[PDB]
Design a protein around this ligand. Sequence first.
Ligand SMILES: Cc1cc(Nc2ccc(F)c(C[C@@]3(C(=O)O)CCN(Cc4cccc(Cl)c4F)[C@H](C)C3)n2)n[nH]1
Ligand SMILES: Cc1cc(Nc2ccc(F)c(C[C@@]3(C(=O)O)CCN(Cc4cccc(Cl)c4F)[C@H](C)C3)n2)n[nH]1
Lengths: 250, 250
Amino acid sequence: WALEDFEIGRPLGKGKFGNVYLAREKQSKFILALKVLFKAQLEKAGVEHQLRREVEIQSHLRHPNILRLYGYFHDATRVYLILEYAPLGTVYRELQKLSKFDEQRTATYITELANALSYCHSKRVIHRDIKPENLLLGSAGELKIADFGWSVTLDYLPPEMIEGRMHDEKVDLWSLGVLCYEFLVGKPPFEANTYQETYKRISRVEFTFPDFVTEGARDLISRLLKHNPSQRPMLREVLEHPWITANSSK
Amino acid sequence: WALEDFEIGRPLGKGKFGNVYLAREKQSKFILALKVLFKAQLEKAGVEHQLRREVEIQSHLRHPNILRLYGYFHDATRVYLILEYAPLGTVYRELQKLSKFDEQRTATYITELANALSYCHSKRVIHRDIKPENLLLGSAGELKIADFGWSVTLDYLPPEMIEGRMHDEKVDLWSLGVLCYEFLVGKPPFEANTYQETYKRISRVEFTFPDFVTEGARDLISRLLKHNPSQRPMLREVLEHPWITANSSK
Ligand SMILES: Cc1cc(Nc2ccc(F)c(C[C@@]3(C(=O)O)CCN(Cc4cccc(Cl)c4F)[C@H](C)C3)n2)n[nH]1
Ligand SMILES: Cc1cc(Nc2ccc(F)c(C[C@@]3(C(=O)O)CCN(Cc4cccc(Cl)c4F)[C@H](C)C3)n2)n[nH]1
C-alpha cells in the first residue's frame, strides 16, 4: 500500500501524532479512514515500538464490534493506518444528542462490547480502559471499539515480580460498569468539579443512581464497579446477566 | 568534582554501562570508590533519566547500612558516581568463605537491613529486591545496601489505575526472608536446576528447612515469605521479632 492508492476526503480528527481522514481506494472505490502518525513525534514520546506491537495485534482482530485495521504502510517520515469507516461516528455524540439511552439500546451496546472483549479474551488479547470518544457506530448501529489499547537474579524475586500482569483483564469490566451508568444516566458515575474530588469518588467507589435507574441495571453496574478487580464478574457473567438478556437485541 | 581530583587504584567491578575503581581524592587522601557510566550506553537502554532520579534519591540517604553516594559529576561522555568504599567487599564472598552464617551474625545482618529499610520508609523511599552481590561490608562489619534500586480521562479510570504502586514496599520484606534463609542455610530457598522449576517453587512458595534451622528463625522466614504481599510483616515487626531481639548484636 502507498498514499497514491487513496483519494483523500474530509478530516475525521486531529491528534498529537497525526490526523485522520475519510478516504477511498482509487481503484476499488472502497470507503475507509486513513490515520497518519509522524515517526519523529512517536519516537519523541517513546511510543514508536508500542505502536508497532498494538498495530500487529489489531491486524489480526476481526469482529463486528472492533474497528477493523485493514492494513498499514509507511514512508520515510510517516506511518499510515487503513481503518474501517464507521459512518455514524462516536457514541459520545449520540449520547449528547439523546441526553441518555433507554434500557434496550444500553443493554445491546453492553452486549456488543462484552462480545468484542470475550472474542479478544479467547485470543489472550487484553484491553485497557474504554472511553465513549473511542467507541464508533457502524451504519447498522453496531458499536465499535476504536482505540490503540490492545495488549498480548530469579532466586531473589517475589511471586508478584515473576508472575506478570495479574488482573489487567479486569480493567475493562470496570469500564463496562462506567459506560452502562453513563449510557443510562447521561453522565459518568464519579463526575465532580475538581480532579481531587473525582479521584476521591473513584477510590472510595462512591456512586449513587438517580431514581429512574431500574433494579436490574443497578445490580449489573454494582457488580462491575467493585474496588477489588478480582471480584468483578467474568465477561460470560455480564452476557448472561438477567437485565442484559431481557433488554439486549443481540 | 572532576576526574583529575582523584588518584585511581584497582578495578572493583566491570559492568554493562561502566566500571568501578578504588580511588582516593588527591588533596584530602580520602579513600572511596568511583563508578563510571557511559551516557550513550544508558541512553541505548533507556535508563539515563531513571539513573538521574535514583542518583538524586541516593544523594540524600545517610545511613550506616546504606552505601553512601558522596556525590556525582559528568563530562561530555560519562557519568561518575563517588561512592563509599566498603573494605570487606560483598557479603556473598563471606557466605562462600564460611559456607553459612550462625544465628547471631544472621540476626544482626537482618537488623541492619531492616533498619536501613525503615530509615528509607520514613523518607517515603522504597527499595526493590535485594541480592547478596549488592550487599557490601564496612570495616566494622556493618552490611551496606549497594544498588541503584531506590524509588520515591480520569472519569473512566478504575481505582487500580489511579491509586499508584500499592505494595512495592513489600518486595523487600520477601527479600529479607530469602536472605535470612540464604544466610543460615548457604543457599536461597527456591533454588532449582531449571528456570521453570525455580519459577514454580517461588510462585507456589515451596520451601523447606534443613533440620538445623531453629524454630525462631523458621517463624520469621515463614512470616516474610508470604505469597500475598500485604500479609508480609511491617519492618517494625521484623525488628521486634523475638528471634531477632534474642540473637542480634544491634
Ligand atoms: C477512524 C474512524 C472515524 C470514523 N467515523 C467518523 C464519522 C463521522 C465523524 F464525525 C467522525 C469524527 C469523530 C466524531 O465526532 O464522530 C469520531 C472519531 N474521532 C477520532 C477518533 C477516535 C477514536 C479512534 C479513531 Cl481512529 C479516531 F479517528 C473524532 C475526534 C470525532 N468519525 N470511522 N473510522
Ligand atoms: C562500590 C564499592 C565496592 C567496594 N568494596 C569492595 C572491596 C573489595 C572488593 F573485592 C570489591 C569488589 C566486589 C567483591 O568481590 O567483593 C564487590 C563489589 N562488586 C561490584 C558492585 C556491586 C554492587 C554495587 C557496586 Cl557500586 C559495585 F561496584 C564487585 C563485582 C565485586 N569491592 N566498596 N564500594
